[PDB]
Design a protein around this nucleic acid. Structure first.
Length: 271
RNA sequence: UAGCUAGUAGGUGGGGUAACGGCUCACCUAGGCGACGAUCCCUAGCUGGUCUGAGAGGAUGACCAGCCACACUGGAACUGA
RNA sequence: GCUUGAGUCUCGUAGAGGGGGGUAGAAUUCCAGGUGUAGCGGUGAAAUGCGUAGAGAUCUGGAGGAAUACCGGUGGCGAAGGCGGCCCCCUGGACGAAGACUGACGCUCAGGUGCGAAAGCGUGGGGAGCAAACAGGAUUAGAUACCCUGGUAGUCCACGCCGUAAACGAUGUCGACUUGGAGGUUGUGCCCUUGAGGCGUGGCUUCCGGAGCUAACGCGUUAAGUCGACCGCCUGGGGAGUACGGCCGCAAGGUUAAAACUCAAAUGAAUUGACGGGGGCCCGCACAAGCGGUGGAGCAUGUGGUUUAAUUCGAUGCAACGCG
RNA sequence: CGCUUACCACUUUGUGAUUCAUGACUGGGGUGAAGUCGUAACAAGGUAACCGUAGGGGAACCUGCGGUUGGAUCACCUCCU
RNA sequence: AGGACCGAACCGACUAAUGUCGAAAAAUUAGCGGAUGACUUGUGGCUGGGGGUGAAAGGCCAAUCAAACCGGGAGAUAGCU
RNA sequence: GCUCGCCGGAAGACCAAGGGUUCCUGUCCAACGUUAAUCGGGGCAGGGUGAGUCGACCCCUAAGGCGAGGCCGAAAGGCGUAGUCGAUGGGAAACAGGUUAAUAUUCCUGUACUUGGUGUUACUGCGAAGGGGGGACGGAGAAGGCUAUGUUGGCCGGGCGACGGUUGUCCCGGUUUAAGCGUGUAGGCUGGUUUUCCAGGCAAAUCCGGAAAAUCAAGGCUGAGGCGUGAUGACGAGGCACUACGGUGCUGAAGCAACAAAUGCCCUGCUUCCAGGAAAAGCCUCUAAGCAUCAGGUAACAUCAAAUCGUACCCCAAACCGACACAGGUGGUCAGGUAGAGAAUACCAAGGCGCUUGAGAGAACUCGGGUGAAGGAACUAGGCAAAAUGGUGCCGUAACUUCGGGAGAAGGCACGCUGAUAUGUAGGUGAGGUCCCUCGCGGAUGGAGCUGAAAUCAGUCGAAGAUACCAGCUGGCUGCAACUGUUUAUUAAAAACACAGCACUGUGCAAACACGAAAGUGGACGUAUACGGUGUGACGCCUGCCCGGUGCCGGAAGGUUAAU
RNA sequence: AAUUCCUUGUCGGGUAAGUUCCGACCUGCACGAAUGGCGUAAUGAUGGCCAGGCUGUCUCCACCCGAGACUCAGUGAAAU
RNA sequence: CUUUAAUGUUUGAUGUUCUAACGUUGACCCGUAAUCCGGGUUGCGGACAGUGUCUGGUGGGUAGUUUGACUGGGGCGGUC
RNA sequence: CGCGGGGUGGAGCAGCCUGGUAGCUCGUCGGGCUCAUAACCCGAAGGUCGUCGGUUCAAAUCCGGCCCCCGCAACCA
RNA sequence: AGGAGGUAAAAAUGUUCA
């Protein structure tokens, strides 16, 4: 729940937390882990390509299953685990045979729900089945782009994908952004919206709160000198340039959309 | 103006006043007052009577007269019934 | 002690009373596919807007959100606000019945507590339509309006807050008594149900009116009639339901609540008239159906104005202007 | 008697409450024969009014929502044996 | 619980004096700020010159930075001394 | 050698790093030392570093580096798969005493332990670059159980004392003991056991995991410290004894209890929150391709092996880094007595030092400080600097407010010592005795001893009782920025930057963007409740008018319009 | 006004005296609503102002204890 | 000539479909215990995308440079 | 620079591919409008339709050459 | 008797005193 803290001190007076007692408080499941070192925004060359990245709490990568290629096998959601690499929660599923995996936690979910995957599973939140078996107009998530890629669209807290039309070979999805892109009918998708939908309401409150997230300080252009940023200079807070990126590319209304090989799949762009 | 009092509510003993009594000390009990209005603030001498009013009341308390308080301001005491 | 007060029990009745969970149909909007072509949408007229990228129209399928056609009624329920597609679960009250039981437990009620339309507010979702604010188009002397195309918050759901309305039958509550008629609505008794029924007895309610009452209008067995019990409130208008303080509130403010000053009116019902871009009937060269003129030209003449030593004076909507 | 002690007023120091004048200045209000702009209400006031409430606006007031009547008018033209 | 309070270690460096051919090529003394955090620190790596890095001063990049150092162009050029 | 002063959470004692013989002894004084110098980190010569258990090498990985083929690029070269390196990380095993001029958990005495090679004996199925378990883990907080360690008492030894008292409640000193083995406690964790079956674990599996039955209720794992043993041993104050007078040999009693108590250990625990907290190998176990009179494995025993390098000295400094024997810097460990909350501070212990120029004088002037009559900011750019306040407990505490604060606001009262309440209380700890028992390191009851706040009353001394060191100045008006925080190292610490929050906009994944000739990477093993860019900068009330200039987005028919 | 040149604007308070300060008037040379506007509890080694306390800051310096200065002995620079 | 309708013809384009070029940061198999790579199946796009050559536009992101003299000091003014 | 395009009462804009009609509105004179004003409804000023020439029954119009404007690629004494 | 469908765009203002 969105618990509003008390103003006992500066900094703690604005922080808004999201508690979740339904979440199992124990240590993570060992069989599905491996190290995940930070990169700090440094590529092969070592130079910082993406800025504002560094620090943050150490965390391990939990190999969650997006693919879902297990058919005709019922699974039981054992318990909900907290995933530091996502925005949404993850349920630790336990299959009938005994192999365990993680799946993005859908909305209506608790410890003990029954799910399965295939091409015959009934329409119930948590089941994975191709997008031709799923009725027109339903709400899905974790939609796969290529028939076997794994899962691309709708992978964050509270997001979903609405199948709008199945024109035979393809399936038109009404994306989260208002985008309407056609995807193959053979692509696997999982029903129901993604849980932990109140993640958005959480505020960080402190400047250091953003630090342990991983976000490093971001300096404004007018605070710099002429050589570091196209804006800079001035005797005191002067402007007069046209808003751009640190590398000359115009911002504030400037489309960078240009691929032309994917222009076949888009019905209506975001407005 | 909604809570107020802390020798303050009462009791015991000593003392104290012409005399009763927290009137004053020590100890014990934790009570006492309060919406039929405590405390607080503002105002004011009260009355017998007076002016008016059909009566009921309203306003008021100068002159006559009974009582209370003060005597530059405040505190204290003696004398003496 | 008792019982005509009040309260309780057994059997049932009517109902948008209230809370929660699902479900159904119509329509609007949006979307995909097929058909198909220059309009579509809108107005007092017009335009912004939409459309030859292929709309509107139509058919199929889908998605959502809010409201529930007809039933439906000055009909019903509830204290009031308010509440209606349907089904289930929990639950409140009122009412009728033939008896019994307790035996005044009663009525009212400053303070205090709870509920309390909409608008608005905080947190979280949702978001079709409608639509503050806003945008453009028109209209217009101006139009930051009425009209139109779009459109955010809002309107809907959950948890809290706010606590105000012409919250009004402008009528506080309980109980008793005081001629009737015409209906609705809901129990129940008896007689031949001898047929769409007939005669009584309660609850609630609609209209008209007697007594009576009132300033009148009007209320009139649900009373503003006749009385009693208890509570809130008012003492000219404005100032002002405002100032200051307290309390409550996230905020917007709410609640409690004066004085100074100024005026001598403010206010109600109702009458006679005048008026309305109110209604109705009737009348006239009023309009309509026509004919010939005026204004345009020249000129006679009157007048205003201008001019002038003076161009006497007056008249100057219709009702001055070939008038005195 | 002097000294000392308890009580004690005048008085001082620090910090609150309440109240009266004064206070540059400012909001609103009342008022003043013959000002300005607009025309909001009064008939259906020419978009019905008013209450509550939100937002907007040179002024009145305009718009949305719910509510109330302290709002007027229901005569004329096409269908039926 | 806390980018919470007081305050040593530790980190930092606001005021003043000394020092300025100094004890030192930015310290000492007496006072200051943070001190469970955006903390500090060891060891070890990575990013490079029109490039790096920068809670952004044109600051730092080996006592040197509006473009590091070394070597080579190169005995650059100098209407100047 | 005798007095004296200083540090004592260091100016003490040890490692890593880093230096490189500076360590020790003999001898020498030109140069070096800021003076002299028979002295020394200086010269010359000689001597010194002893390891199966310490560290490294070694085995295994992290960041990251190199990188067969490979992809890519004028060449150089770049990136990267398998692999292979890379600790500050994980992994086997030792403690006490003695000895040297210098080294020793290394040599000697004593008592132990670990991992492998081979052989013997009795049994048994063993066997991977493969699977599972383990290794393997965050921050903060509270408590309990103990220990290092210290104090007091008892006991033993020496003294009874150069000025008054001191055979007594007296004084001084000592009262030390590990590794390993056995028990398996305080405490914590987990419900154990057997059977059957199975689309799972790149193949298989008796092992892991899962699904239903049966049976009993505990079993098992882990674990500081204590107690025995180690040890009728060593050590040990003090004597007995020779002096090259530095020291050596010899001997050697007491060696317990109680209380207080860590930041050490249990704890790689437990509770809670969120920002959600390495990897691989060692080790245990199961099987595949296979191999079974074998080979190997389990257990016991015998014996052998444990190699190579470092090891001296300095390590908060005259030996490192700063040109110096430089008032600077340098990570980690132990850290005692009294007062005290404390690792502050004051004085001391162990231990180590008096900082490598001194002797006189007692001027102006300067630095570092002490005190100051009367006044009290009049000084001055400005209360800059000094002065002053300063602790604990209790009482009491305004405007304003985001209802947390403001606030330790402000301003006052009591503070020493002695006795009594009480031959030291409340409280803590707690032997003996007694009883019971699923008998052990048990549980109740029990109360001596030990230790020990604070409050009240009375008395007493001084000018002052938080007496020293130590240790807030407070209040009012107001600009700016919300606040913690960051920055011009070496003149600027601020109102500048950052900041959570807010808005616009870009991005549909081979994502935008960025580094890079390219490949490939970061973004992200994330995917619109996400990420990038820009602007403003908590929170509250809001955030107006203008689309011509410029930029961007959208419709492009017409005009012009390159290459071809 | 961190913005007002003219200017030490004018009025009131604060002082014996106030170009600074505090509260207002609008004549805004040349504020202005995310290059955000106006407020705002707490916080600040922040800027300006006032009062108390406190004092050698100062009136007006005086005295004293240490380290140099000075004399002697030894070593022995520098800028110019 | 203005305006236009059918046809043939000459080209620029557009629509749609297909699979063999090409892409494939889809799945699967093998080289191989290796998320690179290469090849083989197969799915999805598809003559697009993307790359080279030439060319127009934009382009302070980057680079090389210019920005006069006289002047009763220079700048402004004015002049040549 | 060679293709385009445009000049209209005092000002602002149609008329322009089709020739024959120099108009629509703001502003100024007035006339109506009502009992009055404002408002609107309306008539008239006043434009060498850039200059000049050229086709034709006839010119802003269709045509030309030259002045004046503004949008394009341009331009190496 | 008993009940339905269709039917009005725009026009402000008029000194005080009596």
């Amino acid at each position: 729940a969105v618990v509003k803290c008390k103003p006992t001190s500066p900094g703690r007076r604005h922080v808004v937390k999201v508690v979740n007692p339904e979440l199992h408080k124990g240590k993570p499941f060992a069989p599905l882990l491996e190290k995940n070192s930070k990169s700090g925004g440094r590529n092969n060359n070592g130079r910082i390509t993406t800025r504002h990245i560094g620090g943050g709490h150490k965390q391990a990568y939990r190999i969650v299953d997006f693919k879902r290629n297990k058919d005709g096998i019922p699974a039981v959601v054992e318990r909900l685990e907290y995933d530091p690499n996502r925005s949404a929660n993850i349920a630790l599923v336990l299959y009938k045979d005994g192999e365990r995996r993680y799946i993005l936690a859908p909305k209506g979910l608790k410890a003990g729900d029954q799910i399965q995957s295939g091409v015959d599973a009934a329409i119930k939140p948590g089941n994975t089945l191709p997008m031709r078996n799923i009725p027109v107009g339903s709400t899905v998530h974790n939609v796969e782009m290529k028939p076997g890629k794994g899962g691309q669209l709708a992978r964050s807290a509270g997001t979903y994908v609405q199948i709008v039309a199945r024109d035979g070979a393809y399936v038109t999805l009404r994306l989260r952004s208002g985008e309407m892109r056609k995807v193959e009918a053979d692509c696997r998708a999982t029903l129901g919206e993604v849980g932990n939908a109140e993640h958005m309401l959480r505020v960080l409150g402190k400047a250091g709160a953003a630090r342990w997230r991983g976000v490093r300080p971001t300096v404004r252009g007018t605070a710099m000198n002429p050589v570091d940023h196209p804006h800079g200079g001035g005797e005191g807070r002067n402007f007069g340039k046209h808003p751009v990126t640190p590398w000359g590319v115009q911002t504030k209304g400037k489309k960078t959309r240009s691929n032309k090989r994917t222009d076949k799949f888009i019905v209506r762009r975001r407005s």
